[PDB]
Every structure is written in structure tokens, then in C-alpha cells.
Design a protein around this nucleic acid. Sequence first.
RNA 1: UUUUUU
Lengths: 43, 409, 414
Amino acid sequence: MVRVNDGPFADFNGVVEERLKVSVSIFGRATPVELDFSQVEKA
Amino acid sequence: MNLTELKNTPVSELITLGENMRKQDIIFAILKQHAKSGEDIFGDGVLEILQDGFGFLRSADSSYLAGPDDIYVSPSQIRRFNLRTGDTISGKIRPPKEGERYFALLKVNEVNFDKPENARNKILFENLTPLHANSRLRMERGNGSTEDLTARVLDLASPIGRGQRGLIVAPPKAGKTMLLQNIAQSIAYNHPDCVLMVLLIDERPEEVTEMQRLVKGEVVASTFDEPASRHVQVAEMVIEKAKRLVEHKKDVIILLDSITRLARAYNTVVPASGKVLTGGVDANALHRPKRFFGAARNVEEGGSLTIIATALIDTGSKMDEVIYEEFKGTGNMELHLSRKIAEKRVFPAIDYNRSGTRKEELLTTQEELQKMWILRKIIHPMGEIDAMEFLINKLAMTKTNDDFFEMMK
Amino acid sequence: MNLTELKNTPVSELITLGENMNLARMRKQDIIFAILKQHAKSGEDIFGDGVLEILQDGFGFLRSADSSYLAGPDDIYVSPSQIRRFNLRTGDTISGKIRPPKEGERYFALLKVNEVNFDKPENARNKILFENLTPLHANSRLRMERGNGSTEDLTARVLDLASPIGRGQRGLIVAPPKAGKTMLLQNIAQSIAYNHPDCVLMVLLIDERPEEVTEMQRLVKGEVVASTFDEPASRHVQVAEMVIEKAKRLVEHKKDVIILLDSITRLARAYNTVVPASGKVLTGGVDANALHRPKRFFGAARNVEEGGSLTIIATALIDTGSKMDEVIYEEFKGTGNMELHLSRKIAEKRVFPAIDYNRSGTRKEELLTTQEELQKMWILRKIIHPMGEIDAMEFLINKLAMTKTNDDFFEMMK
RNA sequence: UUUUUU
Ligand SMILES: Nc1ncnc2c1ncn2[C@@H]1O[C@H](COP(=O)(O)OP(=O)(O)O)[C@@H](O)[C@H]1O
Ligand code: BEF
Ligand code: BEF
Ligand SMILES: [Mg+2]
Ligand SMILES: [Mg+2]
């Protein structure tokens, strides 16, 4: 699990599938996006 | 003993009061008899300066037009306190003498709800330093109301700050007027500090009475029963009154319906220039309505003038497209309403993608703006109708937009 | 002891300075007038300055910037003899010794002219006029890219790749309302102040929002002349004429002037408002003779072989529903030589800068780029062309954000 | 007014 603190996906959690391939559960549609290592924080 | 106070009281109480000592005559005779006693008389109204240099105090019961009980203000009085059209005036008055037809002003007690001397020293509206809107005017009640939906969507689609210059743009019967009424209610509840005025130009008469019994503010109207000449004069008085209050560091809001029809009125009375734009609009006709809409502004010195006006589109008349696009290049906020959404009875029928506010980062917190930005990226691919059905179903799940944002996480 | 210097100083310092020589009651203008007179009594010299405007009778006045170069109470009278002596013409910045008005006079008079366009007055007698300067295509590149890795710098970088700007360029930021024209012009102004402090930067604002005026004067390191939409078309025209003539004078002094105009479409509308009816009206309600004046205004911008240049980057409107603006825009395109298009479709997706890459471009861009820089831009355009408007900008911005400068981006392309 | 705007 991963936390996003930068950009629109700031203040959200997720999981890294495999830059880091982290999807965010927004609304009722997963948004898979790639964030840098500093753009996100470990859960 | 005040003139407008006597005009407000019912005739029954006036007749009883006069016996203790047409309705217009009851008031006149009562005022004269009180003057005979040597006791003072008082009156009030908004100033309108004529071309000759003298003015009158128009009354709200005449929509600030010429009235029988208007109070004459001498030129010397206007020069003494640097009075200008729009200034609310209260003072002692006397009945007309022989050869006179009007009540005269003896001494001015109050100029714009303030000391008359201070009106001599003030910074004029033309000299106030303009700014983009800083202070957010949040419309959301938060009471979980079904009407509140309109406010909530508004906050997300096109925020409104103090000094905003906005437009509720839509075809006839899309929901512009009722959206303006929803805004008026939100203003009365969330911002009772603001001076709310509702200007109705060339619209339905039943909406006038509906608005004056609904909003907690002042309502000035000039229905479609009235000529364009009247529309223009009334609007000029209201806008000047707003400017004066802003000179007193007040936050004024004018809900105008409709500004497209006001622009049409200007085009009706404008002198022909020999040049006519597409749609039948004189090349010089939009300068005046543009200055009227452009009055709305944020002031660094203190106070602001907000104007939220409705505009028409897809009327089949190119003139309204011209007027709308001209006002868009003047203002900084547009809430679009869609006829397609309104025909499916989906309300509020808001065209999300087309709506928006300029410099909305000055009216929102950092995270609020980031959440709105995401929300727009999600709604953009959807159709007009799908977008609103989606957003309203999601918002209806919670009472406030804050809880909705927390759900987004 | 200078007039405009006294006008700039706050009233507090003026009252103290005057008491050293009751001023509290009278208006600030009177404090300055009385102080100037008292200094004249001592026999000491007085000085003033402003931009010249020659009236029809043959005499002129020195308008001041605090009046937007319109008629002002502190205007300095310039006698016809003075104008003939140094061949002065409207727009000439003048500095010189002045005297308070005598009995029966209402204006400060000019005794001797010390400086004409920041130069010796004699040299203004001998100069090549703007009408006689030999025109050229832009030679010297005006690179907008900061290189500071800034997120604002993105707009500059894309600009350099899509439509380079040289000295003497005649360009247009064309876009529908709310596409990003004004903020792109502000980005350009910042890039000019940092990368080209040598250039004389002027920002002319015609018929636009008043808050943008104050935003621009506190943001750009240059002179800002404005005439908001609160003002009539008559004022727009007169103000623009003064600014363009001032630019021409500075170019006669081998200066590189830049005018950021917003909006030139609205300036063209103002001309159409005051133009005499010809009995012939073009598509959209534009008089057949209305665009000659605005065309000469935009066409003023040019590169001079003798020295200096006049650049004009002005914003234009499209897709307004009013055909008049399509006519004005297409007429200006056939006058200028650079267009940066901004797309409403890209701007509604909140993708900035919302630049329409394919439609943008500059004429004779080989005169403003190195051989390899041009080859790299050419390849980049061939790659971006098949993409959609939005896809093109998202792709290019994501690729550029990876590096600080366009040079490193080009090295990545290899 | 028509034409032009279309
Ligand atoms: N580079 C940018 N970055 C972020 N937002 C922008 C940018 N350019 C424009 N905008 C947004 O668009 C709005 C209007 O842009 P503006 O430059 O006024 O367009 P126009 O001059 O064409 O009307 C601005 O209030 C701003 O919020
Ligand atoms: F008919 Be709606 F009031 F525009
Ligand atoms: F409304 Be933008 F300034 F063209
Ligand atoms: Mg309505
Ligand atoms: Mg703009």
C-alpha cells in the first residue's frame, strides 16, 4: 500500500502494482496512475 | 414623524391618527398639521440629480421613479456634501409653500446611513483599486435540503466571490430565474452582512411578487409591461446606489434578471451610429451595458460590488449570442444551464463543462481546488445529462460537499 | 526639483518639505504648485517632463503617465518654435526646465529642453524617420525560455518550440475567451523582463478587465498603459495612438521596443466605432475602411536594418459567434508573421498551456533559429501533427516536464 | 429600409 500527497491524487491511498504504478480508488472508478517515489509515501 | 413611515402604515391607522390631531391627502394633511405645531417633520429617499443642478429624493414604492411625495434637494445642499445620484438621504423636511409642488429638504441628517461630513471626504468609486475576487461567497446551506443541491453544484462548478461579475447563461425555460432565487436564499442565510439587491428587467410580473416575498432584501423591478426607457433609467439608479454603498466599504450584491434584456433596452434607446453588428445590435449599443456589468468589482480599499445576471442563448436571434459573448469577455464567471437537461426534468440543469470561474484559486482552499479539479476531469467525458445525473446522485448521498469530498477518498 | 518627482512623493513628505521652505488643508496638487512657486522665487531652477502631444494649432503639451498620457492639470506647454527647432513630433519624451504660469496663463511652460528621447536634443534634429527605416524580417531571436525549471516556464518553452519570437515580430495570441491569452501574455512579459532587460517593454491594455491592469502593473518590470472597458472607444484609440508613436520615436533612437497589446481585436472594434461610415460594410458589421488604421497600428511592428526594432505581441479573439472577430483576426494574420493559437477544448480539460500546436507558427523561423534547432522543431512538428489538440499538449508537456531546458529535451530526442 | 451582415 502507498499514499499519494502530490497532485490531484494527493490525500489518497492505493497499492503499487509494479515510476510507481499506483491506482487510486476515486468515486467508483479505479484511476491507475504512475507517481514518483517522492510523490507518494509508504502506507 | 416620517413621510415614508406614514406611507407604509395602513389607511385605517392614518385616519385614526389624523382624527386624534385619498390616502395621499390624509398623509399630506397630517404632515401639515404636525408642521403647524412647530414639531419637526422627516423624510428620506434615494437622490436623483436633474440636469439643472437640483435633485429629488425618489422613493422605493415608485421604483425610484418620479413620485408625488418626492423631496426637493437644492443645488447648494448637493455641493455642500458632494452628493451624487444614488445617495440614500434622510433629513428634516417641510411641506411645500405657496407656488410650490414638493416637500423640501431643510437639513440632511444621514447620507448613506452615515454622517454627512464623511460623504465630503471619501474615495470615489472610479478611483477604487480593482482586484480579482478574494473572499469566497459560499452558497451551500449545508441543511441537507433538496433545494441546496443547486447551491452545492454551483460551489463546485463556478465558485462566487465578493466582487464577482457572473452570468447564469441558458436558453428560455432552462432554470435561470429559479437558480437566481436559490442564490438569493443562500445569500440571505449565509451572508446576511451583504447588501442584497434584486434588479428585475423586462421579465415576468409574477416573478416580481414571487421574488419580493421570497428574498430577504430589496427588490427593484421593471417588468416587460414597461418600455425600454424605463428599464434603462431604473437600472442606472440601482447601479449608482450600489456604487455609493461600495464607497462606504459595503459588500453589495445585485442579482439581475435579465441582463440580456437590459442590453436590448440600451440598444433600443442608443443613438443610431450608422453601423450595425450581426443580429441587429448597434455598434455603440453595448458600451453602456458593458459598463453596467463591469461595475461589479472587488475593491482593495474595502467592500465590493457583485453582479450575478442571467443571459439568454439559443434564442434563434443572433443578437443574444453577440450580447452573451460580449458579456463573457467582460465578466469572470458563467454558470451554464442546458435545455437538453431541463427537458428531461433533471434539476439543476447545469452544463458542467461550460460553466466555470476565472482565478478560482483565489476563492478556494488548496485541497478544495484539487478536489474540484479531479471532479471536473471525471465529469468532462460524460454527456450533459449523464454528468448531472451522476453528480446529483453522488451529492444526494451526503449533506455537505465536504463529506462528499471525504467520500471521494 | 522636478514636477513628476513631486507628484510621485507622498503628501506627508510634501507637506513637511513645504513647511521647511498651512498646507494641510489644501489639496495635494496645490501643495506641489505652491512648493514649485516658492522654489522659483529663490531663483533656483525647476524641472518637468512628459510625452509630447502636438495640437492642431501648432503648439503642444507634455502629457504625463499618471493621466495615461491624456490631458492633465500639470501639463507643460511646448511652444511651436521649440517644436520646429528640434523637429519634435507627437510621442517624443521631453525633459527640461520649466516655469510656473504667469498672470493670464494656466500651464507650466518649457524654458529649455535638456533631453529628447533620453538623448541630446541636437541629435533629434538629425535622425532617420521611422517611415524611412528599411524593414526586414526578424533576425535576432527573443528566447522566452527561463531555464529555471519553473512550472510557469512550460508556457515559455512550448512557445519557443511552436512559434519563435524575434525582434520586430508582428505576432498574435489568438484564442476564444478564457483560453489563456492574457496569462500567456503575462508569462511573455515575465520572460522579457528576465531574459531581455535591454528591451524597452510596454504593456498596452485596451478594453479589458480592470483587475488585470493592476495585476499587470504590479507583475511586469516595465511601463503599463491601460484603457479598460469602463472607457469609451474614443479613449482607446487616442491612448493607443500615443503609445504607438512613442514606440516609433524610441525605435528612431535604435531601441528595441516591445508592445504587449491586449486586446488588439477590441482595439480594432474601437476603430470601427469611430471610423466615418463609408456606405460599405463588410461581413460581421465592420466598415470597409475601418481596418486600415488598426492594420497600420499592428503593421508598425517591424525589424529595422539601421538599428533597433518594434515588436508587437497582441491578443486576438475567435469563435465568439460574431463574424466581425473572424474578419479582424484573418485580416491581422495577413498583416503579421506569428500566431500562437490557444484552444478552448484544451483549456476546458484544464491542460495548460492550452496551445494548438498545428495552427501556431512563425514565418521565416529559420532566421530566428540555429540549423539544428530548426531541424529538431521540424521533426517535433511532424510527430505532433497526427495527434489531437489535447493529446498533443498532454504529450509535449509530459515530455518537457522531464527536463529543465529545451536543449536537454532535444538531447533526449536523440 | 433594400443590398451587405447571411
Ligand atoms: N498557464 C495557466 N495555468 C493555469 N491556469 C491558467 C493558465 N492560463 C489560463 N489559466 C486559467 O484560465 C483563466 C482565464 O485565462 P485568461 O488568460 O484570462 O484567458 P483569456 O485571456 O483568453 O480570456 C484564468 O483565470 C486561469 O485560471
Ligand atoms: F424564459 Be426564461 F426566464 F429565460
Ligand atoms: F476573456 Be479573455 F480575456 F479573452
Ligand atoms: Mg426567467
Ligand atoms: Mg484576457
